[PDB]
């Protein structure tokens, strides 16, 4: 009907159709703390929301009122909950409500309540047909919106919409290879579909990641994904990887590469590698280089790694 900013908007205390119900002012106590000096419009809407909530009035007027309360404070979870109670009682058209939540999220995508409301609607309708496209639009505006990605994972997993997600991940990585949210989605997609136990899949992933690292050597996300897909089996289980990284070292001694080498050495020592003393010396030299020169912000961590290595493998 009329929005809060509409020229013809009328305060609830002035609406004839609301005259039969008394507004309920907020009880802040005689000596209030953290007292918000509300605008007249804000207080007016909330005084009436408090009244309908208190009377548990499941009406169309109460339903429209929640829309105004939400515009005033979309983080008010009590209003959202009551709105859902009304959606059910009044048997409101859920597709119409989906259109509403779509507009709301577009305006305020960084809010927990709006995304939760949308999830409830999709669950109620058992209809995910608009989800991937809607989410892609939000991500088109902020490619790292946490709520958007979380909602995306839920929809895909709940309705088994895995088919085109790796392509979506690939497109977004092409747009910004440093987008950590996308590398996370890549892991989410693969672990839930083919898994990483398939050696052909793992090889494809290791090659792809190494390629990305060569393109942008200082992009930490690619380095983290490489370790992430190999860490559970153990970094020392991939002998060729060590050699490849070693060749790259002179021309690409980034703290990421050096740190990865220490991680490999750590695992080697943990697995009764041959040349223990040699590997330990190499690992300690690298920890020193990282602590003193290449990654000084993490000097306390690297010094701790050096002491751990000695407590576990000095013999």
């Amino acid at each position: 009907f009329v929005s809060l900013d509409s020229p013809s908007y009328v305060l609830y205390r002035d609406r004839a159709e609301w005259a039969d119900i008394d507004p309920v002012p907020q009880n802040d106590g005689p000596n209030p703390v953290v007292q918000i000096i509300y605008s007249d419009k804000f207080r007016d809407v909330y005084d009436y929301f408090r009244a309908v909530l208190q009377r548990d009035e499941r009406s169309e007027r109460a339903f429209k009122l929640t829309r105004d309360a939400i515009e005033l404070n979309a983080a008010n979870y009590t209003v959202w909950h009551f709105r859902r109670v009304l959606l059910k009682s009044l048997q409101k058209d859920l597709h119409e409500e989906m259109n509403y939540i779509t507009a709301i999220i577009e305006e305020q995508p960084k809010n927990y309540q709006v995304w939760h409301h949308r999830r409830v609607l999709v669950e109620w309708l058992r209809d995910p047909s608009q989800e991937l496209e809607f989410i892609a639009d939000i991500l088109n505006q902020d490619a790292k919106n946490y709520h958007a990605w979380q909602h995306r994972q839920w929809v895909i997993q709940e309705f088994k919409l895995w088919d085109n997600e790796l392509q979506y991940v690939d497109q977004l990585l092409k747009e910004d290879v440093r987008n950590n949210s996308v590398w996370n989605q890549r892991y989410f997609v693969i672990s839930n579909t083919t898994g990483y136990n398939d050696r052909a899949v793992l090889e494809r992933e290791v090659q792809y990641t190494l390629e990305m690292i060569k393109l942008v050597p200082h992009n930490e996300s690619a380095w983290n994904y490489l370790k992430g897909i190999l860490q559970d089996r153990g970094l020392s289980k991939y002998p060729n990887l060590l050699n490849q990284l070693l060749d790259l070292q002179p021309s690409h001694s980034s703290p990421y590469l050096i740190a990865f080498l220490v991680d490999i050495y750590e695992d080697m020592l943990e697995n009764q590698c041959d040349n223990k003393e040699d590997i330990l010396n190499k690992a300690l030299e690298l920890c020193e280089i990282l602590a003193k020169e290449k990654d000084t912000i993490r000097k306390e961590y690297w010094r701790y790694i050096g002491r751990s290595l000695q407590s576990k493998h000095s013999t």
Binding site: V33, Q35, Y77, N184, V216, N224, I229, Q231
Partner: protein, 410 residues
């Protein structure tokens, strides 16, 4: 060494310039934003250096105190967006005043207690304001605020019987908790529940059944913890996850090695502060959410008898974090913030100060080692890494409530 009036800074060393972003000549939105922030931060760093003269950094206590004191009573309509988070405003402000060692007048303490009583729901828990449904976030905030006040008047406001029933009403069979009735679930709920339950002594054997395992499922390939299983690691959710596990004495459920490497990697080599997730920007509030994980990891590893743990420092750059907060996160008018260019708010004031305190104080067993950068008056009161309220407040509250029985349970 140096005269007492000049104190060399890590961020001002000539080698520090080497820490600027290397974009490999491949620009993307991420590198462009990072470079913009680094450019601004360098300007700020340079303004604190006068060739070989580097005056001691100063925490503007009095200005922060006046901003906080004013906020505790009244707020502009710019705060209408936090009308469903009023107990948070109480907690953020009280905790900041507590860190600054500014006493709470009895009148103010009583008024806060009365207000929080009005926010408490008859079904248990606290809502965002009077008459609002209860929600775990403001419940966590209200309980912490009451514990900061620490009077019997404050402790007694909590309806423990209903609080426990309320927690049960949110508990899911997979071990997770809803944030509120008909609400969303994420790691924040588990921490909010574990925090209030342990402080008020209402933990039953079944309350947290499966919770430790659900939290472990949230730890991802990165080593950090996401909001729910499968999601990207974030400092906010990682703090919640690890702190909850520490309360439950189930830290070992996590791969502490990958968590440790992940959190330490979140400290920005150039800025000195912490980012919330990989490839995102530095932000003063992460001084708490991220850096706070180090005292938790230390405690955890120490419990396992790790012989390589330091006996004097947390495993992050304590000095650099203090430099970032003191030089880049203070609003000249009082209050602290995300990064230069942003406006002050109570949330950032709370967390920037909480992080500053963690960076200043190391304690493990009988070992205590302080690193207070700048003038000596910068030293803040210590904060408990699990609850983020004074350790004295934690002991006093737990001692008080341990004298009461777990509601309807033996």
């Amino acid at each position: 060494s140096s005269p007492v009036w000049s104190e060399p800074l890590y961020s001002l060393r000539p080698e520090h310039a080497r820490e600027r972003l290397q974009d490999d000549s491949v620009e993307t939105v991420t590198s462009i934003e990072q470079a913009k922030v680094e450019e601004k931060i360098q300007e700020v760093f340079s303004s604190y250096k006068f060739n070989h003269l580097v005056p001691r950094l100063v925490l503007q206590r009095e200005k922060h105190f006046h901003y906080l004191k004013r906020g505790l009573r009244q707020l502009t309509d710019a705060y209408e967006c936090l009308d469903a988070s009023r107990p948070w405003l109480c907690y953020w402000i009280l905790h900041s005043l507590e860190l600054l060692d500014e006493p709470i007048p009895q009148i103010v303490a009583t008024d806060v207690c009365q207000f929080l009583e009005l926010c408490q729901s008859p079904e248990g828990g606290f809502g965002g304001g009077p008459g609002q449904y209860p929600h775990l976030a403001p419940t966590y905030a209200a309980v912490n605020a009451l514990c900061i006040i620490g009077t019997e008047e404050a402790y007694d406001i909590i309806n423990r019987e209903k609080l426990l029933q309320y927690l049960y009403s949110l508990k899911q069979p997979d071990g997770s908790f809803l944030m509120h009735v008909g609400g969303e679930v994420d790691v924040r709920s588990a921490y909010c529940a574990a925090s209030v339950a342990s402080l008020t002594n209402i933990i039953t054997p079944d309350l947290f059944e499966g919770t430790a395992e659900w939290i472990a499922r949230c730890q991802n390939w990165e080593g950090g913890i996401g909001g729910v299983p499968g999601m990207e690691a974030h400092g906010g959710y990682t703090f919640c996850g690890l702190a909850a596990l520490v309360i439950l004495k189930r830290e070992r459920s996590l791969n502490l090695k990958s968590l440790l490497q992940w959190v330490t990697s979140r400290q920005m080599r150039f800025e000195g502060g912490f980012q919330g997730r990989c490839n995102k920007l530095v932000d003063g509030c992460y001084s708490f959410w991220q850096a706070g994980l180090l005292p938790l990891l230390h405690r955890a590893l120490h419990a396992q008898g790790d012989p390589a743990l330091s006996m004097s420092h947390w495993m992050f750059h304590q000095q650099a974090l203090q430099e970032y907060i003191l030089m880049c996160c203070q609003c000249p008018a009082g209050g602290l913030l995300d990064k230069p260019g942003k406006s002050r708010d109570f949330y950032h004031t709370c967390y920037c100060l909480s992080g500053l305190s963690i960076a200043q104080h190391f304690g493990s067993g009988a070992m205590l080692h302080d690193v207070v950068l700048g003038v000596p008056e910068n030293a803040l009161q210590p904060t408990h890494p699990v609850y983020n309220i004074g350790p004295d407040k934690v002991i006093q509250a737990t001692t008080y409530f341990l004298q009461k029985p777990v509601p309807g349970f033996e």
